[PDB]
Design a protein around this ligand. Sequence first.
Ligand SMILES: CC(C)c1c(Cc2ccccc2)n(COCc2ccccc2)c(=O)[nH]c1=O
Lengths: 408, 547
Amino acid sequence: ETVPVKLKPGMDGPKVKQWPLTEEKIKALVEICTEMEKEGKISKIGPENPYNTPVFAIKKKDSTKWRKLVDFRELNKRTQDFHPAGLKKKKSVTVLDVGDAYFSVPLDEDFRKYTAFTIPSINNETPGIRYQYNVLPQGWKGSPAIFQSSMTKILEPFRKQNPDIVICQYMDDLYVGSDLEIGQHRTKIEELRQHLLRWGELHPDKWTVQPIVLPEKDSWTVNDIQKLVGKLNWASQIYPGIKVRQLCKLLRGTKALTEVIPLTEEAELELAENREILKEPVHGVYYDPSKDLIAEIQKQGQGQWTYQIYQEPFKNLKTGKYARMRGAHTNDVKQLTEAVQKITTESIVIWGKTPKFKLPIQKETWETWWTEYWQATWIPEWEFVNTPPLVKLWYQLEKEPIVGAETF
Amino acid sequence: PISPIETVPVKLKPGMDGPKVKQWPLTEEKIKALVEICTEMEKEGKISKIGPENPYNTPVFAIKKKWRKLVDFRELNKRTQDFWEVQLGIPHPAGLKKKKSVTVLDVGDAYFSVPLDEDFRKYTAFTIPSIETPGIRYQYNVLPQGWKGSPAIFQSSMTKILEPFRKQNPDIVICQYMDDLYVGSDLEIGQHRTKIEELRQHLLRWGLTTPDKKHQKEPPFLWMGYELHPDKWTVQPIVLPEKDSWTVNDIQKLVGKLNWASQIYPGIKVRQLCKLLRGTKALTEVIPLTEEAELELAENREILKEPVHGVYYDPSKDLIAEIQKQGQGQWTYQIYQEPFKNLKTGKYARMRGAHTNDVKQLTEAVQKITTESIVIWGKTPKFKLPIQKETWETWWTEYWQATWIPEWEFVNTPPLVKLWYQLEKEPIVGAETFYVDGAANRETKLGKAGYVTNRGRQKVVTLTDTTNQKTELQAIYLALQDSGLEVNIVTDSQYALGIIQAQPDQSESELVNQIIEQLIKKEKVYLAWVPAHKGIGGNEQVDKLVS
Ligand SMILES: CC(C)c1c(Cc2ccccc2)n(COCc2ccccc2)c(=O)[nH]c1=O
């Protein structure tokens, strides 16, 4: 028996246009889909079905076989509705993919039509191949919810054998957190893993919300004060106690930018007080479940990026930096996508929800190549923006290790 | 005649009923025709006379194309469900792969070959008037011409029927486009012909009639815009209508037709022609061609004589794309495999975006090309761009917005795209420092723009009918004007903060374009921003005098 699933009140199905796919991905999808069709997991549909969701193919971070990824964002937004805080604590979390479990469960036949998707044809010579789901799809939020009851069971034995370990499930992924040492962790994973088959490395503590640090300086030029004052003044939006009157007083005059200016004992203190203020995150910023999580990224350059998660402007919940991984030296898009996936995952672990992204890239650029480097089973919301010069200059000012993180 | 296929379930839009529009009255001569025709069809089983119990009706008409019947489904259509009509993705000749031989089958009248979902047939009811007396009532049993769902349903059905054949003969390519079936292969002629006859007998098994030898279409194929020849494709020549009187409307049509030609003909120009639309009072208004326009219209006539032919695709060869800057903000590209053998060409325009640069723009041309390539060929081309890899690396690396260019090489084909200027990272040590500032009364529009330098030099200019944004930008312009090859400039203007980040070389505002000119003339320029309304000296003394 299948559980009846309905769209939210007054909603109609998604009718999202399929983006162009490259030939390698189209062949792959055909192969993946003919196979699925035999198994009766998906069924060819006609033109009387107006709905449509975009599909694509990726090769997960560990694969030489293509996987099929469907963009159910729209459907999800339109699908009816249905977090162990310790997960963000644990000194070790491993993500597991249980997405295949769903294909074992049938989808309410009345709802199957909304899952329609199209495999496009090169140069449009051929009509697209239209399919639709018979079993719980991956990426769809209704899946983990319906398979919830079953997941609880298959998992129960393990939970009870280790009330220590915290298991949390988000979308297609299963998050396991423990404090055992590495080997000790990994071993208990394989136990769990094997229990799953039987039926058919993250470290949350390093995510310290680093502070902003002003430049200390032996000598100061007019240009330096100005730069400094410009950023401070802007920061006072976050920390109202920041003052600059003493510094702006040392600038009284039409001097050469390169001219050095000796600071007064007052400009000294005013500057010292500001460093003090900046030693800790603004007070009283708590997370509100009923609000959306925003994540905005700034391209700092030379391979560096900065981000901030917040719900209310200036009241960040978490800030950070991120440097490209070897190999992405000549690709901003590759880098950026890697950053999104990382930030999104952190959000899941912490708040258990994906943030909405404000990306510093042109829409056309993003839509054209992001899937080429995407590797997660989920896809967050995102909008494209223009980075204010100052928001970028401020976070460039964030603290970093005196050395880093040491290995022999 | 009527094919033994499973019907597609069709429904009316969510909250609606079938149409019931009155039958437009016909002469005795016309009803006589409509009766003949319908009696024919009823026998073939395409339409069935129906009881009066049917409340819906659609007006039928008789037009002498001898005689021909026409049904007006506008109403039924607008109230019929929607279908998955994403087939509005027209292939491009450059995307077709070469074929030893191609045969085209006609499946037109074969639309009355597909049965209509018998539960929907009832809405298709129409009436044949009388000299007022009874009146003959019919309904469709098959897909009616002009009905919203006929195309969708037929195409889908054709696809089911060709499923078997395509499976057995995977070495046979079949494109379906309306009443046409383009069947091509690389089999020797006798074998190709043997297979077409095989397909034909197959189709016939499914009731689909066979196109008489009389109606056999033959190459070159005239496919909406082009002439597909066995080894190359060409573009149907575009004729410019010559006249001795030009009205606004004629001219716009000209300009529009000439604009689409720009793609396959980079030489075409339309300034003097477009310039003739200035101040126009009516579409019918006649306009005398200036001498420059006359000249222009003539040249275009010439260039349009040259035959523009492309070639087909070979999956065993690389895809290459070369781009040229033909002027500011306008590029041309040609995509090919073998040199000279163009698969296709094109050109891009743009209208003084608030503010960008040639590299940014080159960047956008590249992705535009890339997308259509993925659409047409399933892959992105190798790029041949007129830009130094040093220029690119220098730009991208520091630009505030994520950006990228797929695999490419440098092609030294002038003019090369370059950065016109680059702001200094630090203040120019021996240079004069200009503290600029402008202020205006947004109500009166009386402003002041000016500067004071560390060298004792000053200037205040008063402007009428000005804005705040302009006094600020003007103040920056005055500094650039009065300074030497090296200047340090501090302003509190937020917009200037944008110039620093974006460092544009094209702008919508001609004042901003005048500033760009000044920026390009200098050797070194350091632009610094600071908070307005603050104690900040310099930006307090010049700032106070121009307030
Ligand atoms: C869709 C198929 C059948 C196809 C065609 C036909 C075709 C004709 C009109 C519109 C679309 C397609 N051609 C066009 O070539 C024209 C030609 C080729 C050989 C002999 C005469 C004419 C081609 O080069 N390759 C192909 O694969």
